[PDB]
Design a binder for this molecule. Sequence first.
Ligand code: UQK
Ligand code: BR
Ligand code: MN
Lengths: 18, 429
Amino acid sequence: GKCKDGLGEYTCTSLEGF
Amino acid sequence: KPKLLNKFDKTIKAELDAAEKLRKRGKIEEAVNAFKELVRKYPQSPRARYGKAQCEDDLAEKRRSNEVLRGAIETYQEVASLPDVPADLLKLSLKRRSDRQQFLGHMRGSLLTLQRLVQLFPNDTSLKNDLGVGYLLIGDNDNAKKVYEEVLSVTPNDGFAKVHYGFILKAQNKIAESIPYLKEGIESGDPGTDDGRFYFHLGDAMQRVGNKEAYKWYELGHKRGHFASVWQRSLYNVNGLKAQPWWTPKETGYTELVKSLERNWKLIRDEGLAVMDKAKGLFLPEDENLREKGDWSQFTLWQQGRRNENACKGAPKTCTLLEKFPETTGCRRGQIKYSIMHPGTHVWPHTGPTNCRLRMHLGLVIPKEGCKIRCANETKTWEEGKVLIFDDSFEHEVWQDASSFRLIFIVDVWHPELTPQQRRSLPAI
Ligand SMILES: CC(C)(NC(=O)C(=O)O)C(=O)O
Ligand SMILES: [Br-]
Ligand SMILES: [Mn+2]
């Protein structure tokens, strides 16, 4: 699930590291 | 406070403290191998193993390596392998394991770490909270919900669980039911409840139901640093980028693009029209719950900066024309897409995730009347073959009351003041 036009998901980025 | 020394670890308090010191003074490499010595000579010591893990963690910070952290995570599990681990040390070691599995982006695993933490500590409510979180990171909203239902089942004035229960209800379109949980959670003022998401979505819920001090909430979030302003409510921001609802082609410097869109707009239109006549499934309805009523669908060519090759099959000349403008095709914080909106449609006031992008709309098929978009306080109109621009990080609302369809083409661009470094680096959205 992604944030395209709004902010529905709990987190809109998917962290991967440093 | 915490008691991290079992019976046998106390008889070697000195050694462990010596090595802890080395680590705590900054000598990481010294401490790493001292704890290794402890661990071979004392291969069941839970403190020595926590020592090894903690200094692997500090060294991932030292080097900024995620190798390192990969290793500290198995060592944090190691500590829970051992016999007679004091519960305090147990809780800490596995919590850290989960937290750094999220810092690295491994959510499926963090989920099992946290499930095991809740098994081992069935009366800690914070663990059940942190588990509801781990469920939300993977998008498993049903199970998160249950977790927060248990939590509230047994500590109903827990504000963390309230706000997260609210956020869940809202995301399911339970707008009313979500309002009291969001509000109570926030004012509870507990740890975890001062978060922009909860302000953002409580306000949206009110605007939807017709309650007026939604704006209440928006300005308080402004007070507490979440929102750049009351109208501009994005949350994945780069502070100090010029913020204004409406820009002109000149103001963005992307003028070659605007020109290539306006000059070639009939090509773009006609490819969309073909996709609507012979390939209408490529147009997919909006699944972000932004509509009061109506029919709205989107045919997406670029998302997060990756071209959709099957998608460009149906708009090849358009995709080919855009390839020559990386300021949109590599906007990993935006998209390029056809957007069809039919009559009877109202889009709730809302806000995009990010002030990192500007949004360009090229009029393809625009009726004489019916079709309008407010951003901030200024309401505007599309025009066939022309481009509008705005910061969808601001509040904006749309209506479609015409007697036939309305096709526009959306092209997102990096905000102009953003470095090539910021452009290559920012995590995609
Ligand atoms: C005009 C509308 C709903 N677009 C937005 O709201 C946006 O781009 O953020 C659209 O029809 O596509
Ligand atoms: Br031992
Ligand atoms: Mn919008």
